[PDB]
Design a protein around this nucleic acid. Structure first.
Ligand SMILES: [Mg+2]
Ligand SMILES: [Mg+2]
Ligand SMILES: [Mg+2]
Ligand SMILES: [Mg+2]
Ligand SMILES: [Mg+2]
Ligand SMILES: [Mg+2]
Ligand SMILES: [Mg+2]
Ligand SMILES: [Mg+2]
Ligand SMILES: [Mg+2]
Ligand SMILES: [Mg+2]
Ligand SMILES: [Mg+2]
Ligand SMILES: [Mg+2]
Ligand SMILES: [Mg+2]
Ligand SMILES: [Mg+2]
Ligand SMILES: [Mg+2]
Ligand SMILES: [Mg+2]
Ligand SMILES: [Mg+2]
Ligand SMILES: [Mg+2]
Ligand SMILES: [Mg+2]
Ligand SMILES: [Mg+2]
Ligand SMILES: [Mg+2]
Ligand SMILES: [Mg+2]
Ligand SMILES: [Mg+2]
Ligand SMILES: [Mg+2]
Ligand SMILES: [Mg+2]
Ligand SMILES: [Mg+2]
Ligand SMILES: [Mg+2]
Ligand SMILES: [Mg+2]
Ligand SMILES: [Mg+2]
Ligand SMILES: [Mg+2]
Ligand SMILES: [Mg+2]
Ligand SMILES: [Mg+2]
Ligand SMILES: [Mg+2]
Ligand SMILES: [Mg+2]
Ligand SMILES: [Mg+2]
Ligand SMILES: [Mg+2]
Ligand SMILES: [Mg+2]
Ligand SMILES: [Mg+2]
Ligand SMILES: [Mg+2]
Ligand SMILES: [Mg+2]
Ligand SMILES: [Mg+2]
Ligand SMILES: [Mg+2]
Ligand SMILES: [Mg+2]
Ligand SMILES: [Mg+2]
Ligand SMILES: [Mg+2]
Ligand SMILES: [Mg+2]
Ligand SMILES: [Mg+2]
Ligand SMILES: [Mg+2]
Ligand SMILES: [Mg+2]
Ligand SMILES: [Mg+2]
Ligand SMILES: [Mg+2]
Ligand SMILES: [Mg+2]
Ligand SMILES: [Mg+2]
Ligand SMILES: [Mg+2]
Ligand SMILES: [Mg+2]
Ligand SMILES: [Mg+2]
Ligand SMILES: [Mg+2]
Ligand SMILES: [Mg+2]
Ligand SMILES: [Mg+2]
Ligand SMILES: [Mg+2]
Ligand SMILES: [Mg+2]
Ligand SMILES: [Mg+2]
Ligand SMILES: [Mg+2]
Ligand SMILES: [Mg+2]
Ligand SMILES: [Mg+2]
Ligand SMILES: [Mg+2]
Ligand SMILES: [Mg+2]
Ligand SMILES: [Mg+2]
Ligand SMILES: [Mg+2]
Ligand SMILES: [Mg+2]
Ligand SMILES: [Mg+2]
Ligand SMILES: [Mg+2]
Ligand SMILES: [Mg+2]
Ligand SMILES: [Mg+2]
Ligand SMILES: [Mg+2]
Ligand SMILES: [Mg+2]
Ligand SMILES: [Mg+2]
Ligand SMILES: [Mg+2]
Ligand SMILES: [Mg+2]
Ligand SMILES: [Mg+2]
Ligand SMILES: [Mg+2]
Ligand SMILES: [Mg+2]
Ligand SMILES: [Mg+2]
Ligand SMILES: [Mg+2]
Ligand SMILES: [Mg+2]
Ligand SMILES: [Mg+2]
Ligand SMILES: [Mg+2]
Ligand SMILES: [Mg+2]
Ligand SMILES: [Mg+2]
Ligand SMILES: [Mg+2]
Ligand SMILES: [Mg+2]
Ligand SMILES: [Mg+2]
Ligand SMILES: [Mg+2]
Ligand SMILES: [Mg+2]
Ligand SMILES: [Mg+2]
Ligand SMILES: [Mg+2]
Ligand SMILES: [Mg+2]
Ligand SMILES: [Mg+2]
Ligand SMILES: [Mg+2]
Ligand SMILES: [Mg+2]
Ligand SMILES: [Mg+2]
Ligand SMILES: [Mg+2]
Ligand SMILES: [Mg+2]
Ligand SMILES: [Mg+2]
Ligand SMILES: [Mg+2]
Ligand SMILES: [Mg+2]
Ligand SMILES: [Mg+2]
Ligand SMILES: [Mg+2]
Ligand SMILES: [Mg+2]
Ligand SMILES: [Mg+2]
Ligand SMILES: [Mg+2]
Ligand SMILES: [Mg+2]
Ligand SMILES: [Mg+2]
Ligand SMILES: [Mg+2]
Ligand SMILES: [Mg+2]
Ligand SMILES: [Mg+2]
Ligand SMILES: [Mg+2]
Ligand SMILES: [Mg+2]
Ligand SMILES: [Mg+2]
Ligand SMILES: [Mg+2]
Ligand SMILES: [Mg+2]
Ligand SMILES: [Mg+2]
Ligand SMILES: [Mg+2]
Ligand SMILES: [Mg+2]
Ligand SMILES: [Mg+2]
Ligand SMILES: [Mg+2]
Ligand SMILES: [Mg+2]
Ligand SMILES: [Mg+2]
Ligand SMILES: [Mg+2]
Ligand SMILES: [Mg+2]
Ligand SMILES: [Mg+2]
Ligand SMILES: [Mg+2]
Ligand SMILES: [Mg+2]
Ligand SMILES: [Mg+2]
Ligand SMILES: [Mg+2]
Ligand SMILES: [Mg+2]
Ligand SMILES: [Mg+2]
Ligand SMILES: [Mg+2]
Ligand SMILES: [Mg+2]
Ligand SMILES: [Mg+2]
Ligand SMILES: [Mg+2]
Ligand SMILES: [Mg+2]
Ligand SMILES: [Mg+2]
Ligand SMILES: [Mg+2]
Ligand SMILES: [Mg+2]
Ligand SMILES: [Mg+2]
Ligand SMILES: [Mg+2]
Ligand SMILES: [Mg+2]
Ligand SMILES: [Mg+2]
Ligand SMILES: [Mg+2]
Ligand SMILES: [Mg+2]
Ligand SMILES: [Mg+2]
Ligand SMILES: [Mg+2]
Ligand SMILES: [Mg+2]
Ligand SMILES: [Mg+2]
Ligand SMILES: [Mg+2]
Ligand SMILES: [Mg+2]
Ligand SMILES: [Mg+2]
Ligand SMILES: [Mg+2]
Ligand SMILES: [Mg+2]
Ligand SMILES: [Mg+2]
Ligand SMILES: [Mg+2]
Ligand SMILES: [Mg+2]
Ligand SMILES: [Mg+2]
Ligand SMILES: [Mg+2]
Ligand SMILES: [Mg+2]
Ligand SMILES: [Mg+2]
Ligand SMILES: [Mg+2]
Ligand SMILES: [Mg+2]
Ligand SMILES: [Mg+2]
Ligand SMILES: [Mg+2]
Ligand SMILES: [Mg+2]
Ligand SMILES: [Mg+2]
Ligand SMILES: [Mg+2]
Ligand SMILES: [Mg+2]
Ligand SMILES: [Mg+2]
Ligand SMILES: [Mg+2]
Ligand SMILES: [Mg+2]
Ligand SMILES: [Mg+2]
Ligand SMILES: [Mg+2]
Ligand SMILES: [Mg+2]
Ligand SMILES: [Mg+2]
Ligand SMILES: [Mg+2]
Ligand SMILES: [Mg+2]
Ligand SMILES: [Mg+2]
Ligand SMILES: [Mg+2]
Ligand SMILES: [Mg+2]
Ligand SMILES: [Mg+2]
Ligand SMILES: [Mg+2]
Ligand SMILES: [Mg+2]
Ligand SMILES: [Mg+2]
Ligand SMILES: [Mg+2]
Ligand SMILES: [Mg+2]
Ligand SMILES: [Mg+2]
Ligand SMILES: [Mg+2]
Ligand SMILES: [Mg+2]
Ligand SMILES: [Mg+2]
Ligand SMILES: [Mg+2]
Ligand SMILES: [Mg+2]
Ligand SMILES: [Mg+2]
Ligand SMILES: [Mg+2]
Ligand SMILES: [Mg+2]
Ligand SMILES: [Mg+2]
Ligand SMILES: [Mg+2]
Ligand SMILES: [Mg+2]
Ligand SMILES: [Mg+2]
Ligand SMILES: [Mg+2]
Lengths: 187, 134, 59, 76, 98
RNA sequence: UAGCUGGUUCUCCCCGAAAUGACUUUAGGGUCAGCCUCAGGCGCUGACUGGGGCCUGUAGAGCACUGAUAGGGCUAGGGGGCCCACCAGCCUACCAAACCCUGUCAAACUCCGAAGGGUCCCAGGUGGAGCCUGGGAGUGAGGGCGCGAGCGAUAACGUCCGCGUCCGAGCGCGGGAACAACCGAGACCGCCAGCUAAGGCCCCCAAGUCUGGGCUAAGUGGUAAAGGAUGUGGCGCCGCGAAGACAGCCUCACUGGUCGAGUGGCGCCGCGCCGAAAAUGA
RNA sequence: AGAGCGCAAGGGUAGAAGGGGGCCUGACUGCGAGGCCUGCAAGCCGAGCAGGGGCGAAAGCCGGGCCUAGUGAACCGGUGGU
RNA sequence: UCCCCCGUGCCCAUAGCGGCGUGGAACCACCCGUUCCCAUUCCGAACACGGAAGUGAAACGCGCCAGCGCCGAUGGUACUGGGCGGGCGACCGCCUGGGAGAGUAGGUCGGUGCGGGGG
C-alpha cells in the first residue's frame, strides 16, 4: 500500500484536523520528521494495512519510503485517530506483529461452543524482506476447553517469534446460555 | 468483593481515561454519556443479551461495579448514609467500552447489544472492530 | 524596545484583586485613560495581565 | 458515627528554603522522619528537626540512593 | 560494614585512612569535602622489613614525619573494617609518637 | 436586675470596615488577634510584574507498593471424563491460592506528575503603597454567583469548607419585560453638547423593515428526557444497471414488454417532528 | 526490605533507629545564642559555656526511649530541705 | 604525557542481575600455622597474630554479549494559570501561555577526582 504524505511544521496540530488532514511522524534510528496525511485516504489504507502490511509514503521530496504504522493515538469519546506514527524500515531484522489465520472448525465449536481468538496477530522479529502476509494455524483439534500456544505455530522461513513461547494464542470456551441463568438464579 | 468501606462521591471529569477499544469480541457497546451504572443494570443488560441469543457465543463485561453507593433511610441530616440500597456501581465516562460479544453474526450481535442500550441509563453506540489496535 | 501606549478600555469591576493592582502598577486609574510606559519585561508582564481590559500600541 | 475526630495539625515542613540567609540555630526543616538529612553545618534534634549550626546561606542537595541533604554554606 | 567511615566523616576532618593487606599496610591522611589526599605513608609496598606490627609503628611515625612537616594535627583515625588492634593499633601507636 | 426589644434630636468635608481565628456553663454575649480610622516617627519597602533558586504531591496518568478486578492460560487444594482406587496424567461445557497474558478500578493505593501555589535574591513599581509607636472603633447571623471538594439523592432559593467576585455599604445609573448580588459601569455639582459600553436598531420605544449567503414551515423560535419516524436540506461509503436495470404491469429477480435511467441499503451533520396532561383569563 | 523498631496510624530506617554482648546510670547540676509554632497562655528544637562524671585507643557520643498521643492554669493544703 | 594494579571520594543502576572470556611479574585475595596479642552464646567460620608452600578455583580487577533490569526522546493527547463562548443539566467548545503519565524510536554491561605502587 502506498499513500501520499506531506511535511508538517509549526502548523497548529488542531488546525490541520479541521482541514481533514491528520498529523503524524515518521522515524527510525536515523531520522524523524513532522508530517500529515489526508484522513480519508489514510482511513481507507489503514483499514487493510493497519500495522501488518507495509506502507510506502510518497513525500513531495519525491522520496518514497518503506514505513510501518507503529501506533495510532485515538481520541476517546467517539473513537477516531488523532495522530499516526510511521517506522521507516531499512534492512535489519525489525520486529513487528503478523496476522493469523485460524483455519478449520474446532472440535468444540462444531459440537456447540465458541472460539475466543486471543491474539489476532503475533509479534515477531523478522527481516523487512520477509513480510509474511499471515501465518496458518490448524485450530481444528481444539475441543471445548482446549487452547493453543505460541509454541505451537507454523513458523515460516526466516521468521521467528519475539513474544513468549508459552504465550496463549487462542482457546475454545463454553457458550452463553439461558439454561445457565436458571442455575445462576438459584445461587 | 472485599475491599474496604464506603466511598466518597467524586465528580465525573472529562472522558479522559473513560474510554478504550474493542479487545475481546467482534462487536462492542460503548458509552456516550457519563454515569454511574448500577450493578442491577449490568445484570439486566447482560441477561438481556444471553436471553436473546440463547445458547449464544460469549459475553464480555468490561466494567465492574466497585463503587459503594450510599443512601439515607428517609430521615433528616446526620451521620453518613449506610445506604447501599443500590449497593455498588461503576463510574463510566463517554467512550468507555462496556460489553463485547463474539461467536455470533451481525444480526445476533447488533440486536443483542442494542437491547442492552435500552437496559442502560445512557445513550450508546455499537462498534465493529474497525482495524485500530495498539 | 520602544514604548507602549496603553489604554484602559474595560472596567475591572468584577475582576480579581490582583488584576486591579496590576492597573495601579501601570498607573491606570480612570477608564479610557491614555498611558505611555517604556517597554520592559516588568511592565509588559502587568500589561499582558490586564490585556483583556486594556489595548496597547507601540510608540 | 464513631468518627468525626482528628488531632491538632502540626505545622511541619521545610522552614527555610535554598538561597536564604540564616542565623546560627535557625530551624531549617521540621519533619516526620528523615525526609531530609543533615549535612554541612546542619545538625538535627531528637524530633528530626534540622537546624543551622552556623550563619550562612542554606543550600539543598539530592543524592538518590543516598537521600536529600540540607546545608549551610557560610561566608559570614 | 563501612558504617564507621560514615561516623568519622560527619565529625571533623583529616581522615587517617588505613588499609592493610595480608602482607601490607597503607595509610593516607585525606581532606574530604573535596576528596584529596595530603600525605601517603605506604608501608610494605614501600621499603620496610617483615614483621607486620613492628612494621606498623615504623610507618606510623613515618607518616607523622611527612605529615606534621606540612603542618597537620587532626588525628581523625579511620579505623577501617579492622578492629582497633595489633597492626592497625601499632600504626596508630606510631603516629602517637611522631 | 434585664448578656433582651425599642428609642437616641443640627450641617458640610475626608477615610471607611466586619459578619473570620482562638478560648469562653461559650453559642443572638464577651476577651485577644484580623479588618477601619486619627496622630507621631521611618522612607522605597508595598500590592502587582520580570529573572533566578529551593519547597510541594493536587489535575492527569499509572499498577511498581496496599487493595479491588473480568476473560484466559498455568497450576496447590475440591469434584472426576477414560474410571482407578489401598494410584494416575494430558484433560473434563466443575469450585479455586500462588504465578503469567489480555483488560480495568481506588479520598484514606503511587514507579510517575503538570498547570499552579509558597518563599528567598536581584529589578521595575511614589501608591489613600508599606513598616514602627500609640488614641478611637465597629465587626464576630452574612448572602448570591463562578470554581474545587464533603454531606445530600451527580434533590433543594439545601448544607459545610476552600479560591475569587459582587450585594452587604452601589435597592444610585444602562441592559436583562418587571428582579440586592446576571451583562455594562464605580453617580462632587451644573449643561435643551459630543463619544461609546452592555443590549439593541418592525410598532409600542432611541437607532437599518441595511447589504451579501444559507437553514427552518414547526409559532419551532417562545425555553423537557429516554426513545421513535420515506420531515427537510448537506456529506460519505457500500450493493444492482442501457449486457435495459427500479416500481407496476398478479409480481419482486429477469428477457422480449415498457416508462426505459436511475435504484436499493447504510452511516455522519444542520434545522425541525412526535414523545408533551392542571387546576381564576389568556 | 514486603521484617523489626513495647502499643494506633503515619513518616522514617539495614551505610540502623533493627538483633547480640562489655562496661556503665548525662531518666546530671547551673545555664542557654538562635529559632519552629502562636490571639494570650502554652507547646517544640537547640549549638554552646561552666561544674562534676560515663563509655571509647581516639575523633567523639550522653541533659532518657526512631519520632509525632500517654495529659491539667491558678487557687488551697501535705511533705522534705534552705 | 601512556598502560596496569592498590587505597579513597564524587555521580548515584546508562554504575545492576546473568552469561562467556581474561589477569598472578606486581598488586590483592585465597592460602599455611594457632606459640604470642585478640576471638567463638560452639568452631581460628568471623575478629587476631606469625608467615613460607600452593592457586587464580572462590572473591576481586579488566573485557565482551542487550535475555531481565535500568535509562528513554520526537510527535500527539490529557490536564491546566489567564481570557472567552454554549446547554436543563451530568457537561461541552474556542483563544492564549505552560504541558505530562503511558507507549513508540532508541540508549545502556559505566563515568570521574585525588593519592600510592609497578612498566
Ligand atoms: Mg450510531
Ligand atoms: Mg498488547
Ligand atoms: Mg492498552
Ligand atoms: Mg462586570
Ligand atoms: Mg476585587
Ligand atoms: Mg468621575
Ligand atoms: Mg483627559
Ligand atoms: Mg472510627
Ligand atoms: Mg474532623
Ligand atoms: Mg480537621
Ligand atoms: Mg527558622
Ligand atoms: Mg541532643
Ligand atoms: Mg530520640
Ligand atoms: Mg540546586
Ligand atoms: Mg548508594
Ligand atoms: Mg581500607
Ligand atoms: Mg455583658
Ligand atoms: Mg424598651
Ligand atoms: Mg454632610
Ligand atoms: Mg467642605
Ligand atoms: Mg459626603
Ligand atoms: Mg480623614
Ligand atoms: Mg460568623
Ligand atoms: Mg485550642
Ligand atoms: Mg483563651
Ligand atoms: Mg463568640
Ligand atoms: Mg445573649
Ligand atoms: Mg477587636
Ligand atoms: Mg479579615
Ligand atoms: Mg510634624
Ligand atoms: Mg535614603
Ligand atoms: Mg522601589
Ligand atoms: Mg517573581
Ligand atoms: Mg520566576
Ligand atoms: Mg524562564
Ligand atoms: Mg512524589
Ligand atoms: Mg485533592
Ligand atoms: Mg484521578
Ligand atoms: Mg493496573
Ligand atoms: Mg496493583
Ligand atoms: Mg513499591
Ligand atoms: Mg501504600
Ligand atoms: Mg494486584
Ligand atoms: Mg473480560
Ligand atoms: Mg478471574
Ligand atoms: Mg470463568
Ligand atoms: Mg477459568
Ligand atoms: Mg475418575
Ligand atoms: Mg462420580
Ligand atoms: Mg474406595
Ligand atoms: Mg476396588
Ligand atoms: Mg497405598
Ligand atoms: Mg491401606
Ligand atoms: Mg488407603
Ligand atoms: Mg482406602
Ligand atoms: Mg483392597
Ligand atoms: Mg480399602
Ligand atoms: Mg488459581
Ligand atoms: Mg473463575
Ligand atoms: Mg493472581
Ligand atoms: Mg475525593
Ligand atoms: Mg485506610
Ligand atoms: Mg511517585
Ligand atoms: Mg518517566
Ligand atoms: Mg513543578
Ligand atoms: Mg513548580
Ligand atoms: Mg518563584
Ligand atoms: Mg538584602
Ligand atoms: Mg525592589
Ligand atoms: Mg511620592
Ligand atoms: Mg507616603
Ligand atoms: Mg485605601
Ligand atoms: Mg479601598
Ligand atoms: Mg519597611
Ligand atoms: Mg502593635
Ligand atoms: Mg490603632
Ligand atoms: Mg485600643
Ligand atoms: Mg470589640
Ligand atoms: Mg469568630
Ligand atoms: Mg446565617
Ligand atoms: Mg455563628
Ligand atoms: Mg464569608
Ligand atoms: Mg462568598
Ligand atoms: Mg458557592
Ligand atoms: Mg470561578
Ligand atoms: Mg476530588
Ligand atoms: Mg457528580
Ligand atoms: Mg435537580
Ligand atoms: Mg451543592
Ligand atoms: Mg475543603
Ligand atoms: Mg463595593
Ligand atoms: Mg432602585
Ligand atoms: Mg426605596
Ligand atoms: Mg432594568
Ligand atoms: Mg439594574
Ligand atoms: Mg443592593
Ligand atoms: Mg445591584
Ligand atoms: Mg459611576
Ligand atoms: Mg459638590
Ligand atoms: Mg459633570
Ligand atoms: Mg443650552
Ligand atoms: Mg470613544
Ligand atoms: Mg469612538
Ligand atoms: Mg428600524
Ligand atoms: Mg405598549
Ligand atoms: Mg423607531
Ligand atoms: Mg430587516
Ligand atoms: Mg438574508
Ligand atoms: Mg405542533
Ligand atoms: Mg417541566
Ligand atoms: Mg422538543
Ligand atoms: Mg429532564
Ligand atoms: Mg437524561
Ligand atoms: Mg437530547
Ligand atoms: Mg431528542
Ligand atoms: Mg432507527
Ligand atoms: Mg414536519
Ligand atoms: Mg439527506
Ligand atoms: Mg434487485
Ligand atoms: Mg431467470
Ligand atoms: Mg423500455
Ligand atoms: Mg447492506
Ligand atoms: Mg460516520
Ligand atoms: Mg405537540
Ligand atoms: Mg387535553
Ligand atoms: Mg393551562
Ligand atoms: Mg522488595
Ligand atoms: Mg516498615
Ligand atoms: Mg524484634
Ligand atoms: Mg498497617
Ligand atoms: Mg511505618
Ligand atoms: Mg540511610
Ligand atoms: Mg544498632
Ligand atoms: Mg538491642
Ligand atoms: Mg544495639
Ligand atoms: Mg547488655
Ligand atoms: Mg548495651
Ligand atoms: Mg551474661
Ligand atoms: Mg551571645
Ligand atoms: Mg530568642
Ligand atoms: Mg529561647
Ligand atoms: Mg515563626
Ligand atoms: Mg508565644
Ligand atoms: Mg489576652
Ligand atoms: Mg509566653
Ligand atoms: Mg502535646
Ligand atoms: Mg549541648
Ligand atoms: Mg570525660
Ligand atoms: Mg589521637
Ligand atoms: Mg548534647
Ligand atoms: Mg538521648
Ligand atoms: Mg524503645
Ligand atoms: Mg536506644
Ligand atoms: Mg489536659
Ligand atoms: Mg486527668
Ligand atoms: Mg494531669
Ligand atoms: Mg495548678
Ligand atoms: Mg478558687
Ligand atoms: Mg503553701
Ligand atoms: Mg514547708
Ligand atoms: Mg617525558
Ligand atoms: Mg616522564
Ligand atoms: Mg594533566
Ligand atoms: Mg590518558
Ligand atoms: Mg581507583
Ligand atoms: Mg569529589
Ligand atoms: Mg550475585
Ligand atoms: Mg583464566
Ligand atoms: Mg588461561
Ligand atoms: Mg603467586
Ligand atoms: Mg602446614
Ligand atoms: Mg609453635
Ligand atoms: Mg596456649
Ligand atoms: Mg548468643
Ligand atoms: Mg562464650
Ligand atoms: Mg586460618
Ligand atoms: Mg583476618
Ligand atoms: Mg603469606
Ligand atoms: Mg605464591
Ligand atoms: Mg576468577
Ligand atoms: Mg568455576
Ligand atoms: Mg571490564
Ligand atoms: Mg567491572
Ligand atoms: Mg546477551
Ligand atoms: Mg528488549
Ligand atoms: Mg522539537
Ligand atoms: Mg512530548
Ligand atoms: Mg504539543
Ligand atoms: Mg486553556
Ligand atoms: Mg437553549
Ligand atoms: Mg436529568
Ligand atoms: Mg455548571
Ligand atoms: Mg502553548
Ligand atoms: Mg518539553
Ligand atoms: Mg515534566
Ligand atoms: Mg498511554
Ligand atoms: Mg497497559
Ligand atoms: Mg512517537
Ligand atoms: Mg559487570
Ligand atoms: Mg555507560
Ligand atoms: Mg559505552
Ligand atoms: Mg557514558
Ligand atoms: Mg583522576
Ligand atoms: Mg601516582
Ligand atoms: Mg602497585
Ligand atoms: Mg620500562
Ligand atoms: Mg616500556
Amino acid at each position: 500500500y502506498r499513500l501520499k504524505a506531506y511535511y508538517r511544521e509549526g502548523e497548529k496540530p488542531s488546525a490541520l484536523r479541521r482541514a481533514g488532514k491528520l498529523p503524524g511522524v515518521m522515524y527510525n534510528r536515523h531520522l524523524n520528521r513532522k508530517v500529515y496525511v489526508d484522513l480519508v485516504e489514510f482511513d481507507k489504507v489503514f483499514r487493510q494495512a493497519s500495522i501488518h502490511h507495509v506502507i510506502v509514503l510518497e513525500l513531495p521530496d519525491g522520496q518514497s519510503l518503506p514505513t510501518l504504522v507503529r501506533q495510532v493515538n485515538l481520541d476517546k469519546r467517539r473513537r477516531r485517530p488523532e495522530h499516526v506514527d510511521f517506522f521507516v524500515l531499512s534492512d535489519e531484522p525489525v520486529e513487528m506483529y503478523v496476522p493469523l489465520r485460524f483455519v478449520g472448525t474446532p472440535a468444540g465449536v462444531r459440537a456447540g461452543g465458541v472460539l475466543q481468538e486471543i491474539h489476532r496477530d503475533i509479534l515477531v522479529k523478522v527481516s523487512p524482506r520477509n513480510i509474511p502476509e499471515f501465518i496458518e494455524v490448524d485450530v481444528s483439534g481444539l475441543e471445548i476447553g482446549d487452547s493453543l500456544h505460541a509454541s505451537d505455530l507454523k513458523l515460516p522461513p526466516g521468521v521467528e517469534l519475539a513474544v513468549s513461547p508459552e504465550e496463549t494464542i487462542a482457546a475454545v470456551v463454553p457458550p452463553e446460555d439461558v439454561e445457565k441463568l436458571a442455575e445462576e438464579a438459584a445461587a | 468483593r472485599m475491599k474496604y468501606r464506603k466511598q466518597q462521591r467524586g465528580r465525573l471529569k472529562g472522558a479522559t481515561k473513560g474510554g478504550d477499544y474493542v479487545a475481546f469480541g467482534d462487536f462492542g457497546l460503548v458509552a456516550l454519556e457519563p454515569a454511574w451504572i448500577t450493578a442491577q443494570q449490568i445484570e439486566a443488560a447482560r441477561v438481556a443479551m444471553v436471553r436473546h441469543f440463547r445458547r449464544g457465543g460469549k459475553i464480555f463485561i468490561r466494567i465492574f461495579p466497585d463503587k459503594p453507593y450510599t443512601k439515607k433511610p428517609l430521615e433528616v441530616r446526620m451521620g453518613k448514609g449506610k445506604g447501599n440500597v443500590e449497593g455498588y456501581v461503576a463510574v463510566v465516562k463517554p467512550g468507555r467500552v462496556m460489553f463485547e460479544v463474539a461467536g455470533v453474526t451481525e444480526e445476533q450481535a447488533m440486536e443483542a447489544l442494542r437491547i442492552a442500550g435500552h437496559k442502560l441509563p445512557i445513550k450508546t453506540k455499537i462498534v465493529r472492530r474497525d482495524a485500530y489496535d495498539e | 524596545m520602544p514604548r507602549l501606549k496603553v489604554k484602559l478600555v474595560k472596567s475591572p469591576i468584577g475582576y480579581p484583586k490582583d488584576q486591579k493592582a496590576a492597573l495601579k502598577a501601570l498607573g491606570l486609574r480612570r477608564l479610557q485613560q491614555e498611558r505611555v510606559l517604556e517597554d520592559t519585561p516588568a511592565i509588559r508582564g502587568n500589561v499582558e495581565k490586564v490585556a483583556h481590559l486594556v489595548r496597547v500600541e507601540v510608540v | 458515627t464513631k468518627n468525626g475526630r482528628d488531632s491538632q495539625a502540626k505545622r511541619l515542613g521545610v522552614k527555610r528554603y535554598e538561597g536564604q540567609v540564616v542565623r546560627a540555630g535557625n530551624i531549617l526543616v521540621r519533619q516526620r522522619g528523615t525526609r531530609f538529612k543533615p549535612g554541612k553545618n546542619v545538625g538535627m534534634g531528637r524530633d528530626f528537626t534540622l537546624f543551622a549550626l552556623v550563619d550562612g546561606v542554606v543550600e539543598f542537595q539530592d543524592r538518590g540512593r543516598l537521600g536529600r541533604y540540607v546545608h549551610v554554606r557560610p561566608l559570614a | 560494614k563501612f558504617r564507621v567511615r560514615n561516623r568519622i566523616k560527619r565529625t571533623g576532618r583529616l581522615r587517617l585512612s588505613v588499609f592493610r593487606s595480608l602482607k601490607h599496610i597503607y595509610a593516607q591522611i585525606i581532606d574530604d569535602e573535596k576528596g584529596v589526599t595530603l600525605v601517603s605513608a605506604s608501608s610494605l609496598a614501600l621499603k620496610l622489613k617483615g614483621n607486620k606490627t613492628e612494621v606498623a609503628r615504623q610507618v606510623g611515625r613515618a607518616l607523622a614525619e611527612k605529615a606534621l612537616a606540612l603542618g597537620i594535627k587532626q588525628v581523625a583515625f579511620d579505623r577501617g573494617p579492622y578492629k582497633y588492634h595489633g597492626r592497625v593499633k601499632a600504626l596508630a601507636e606510631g603516629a602517637r609518637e611522631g
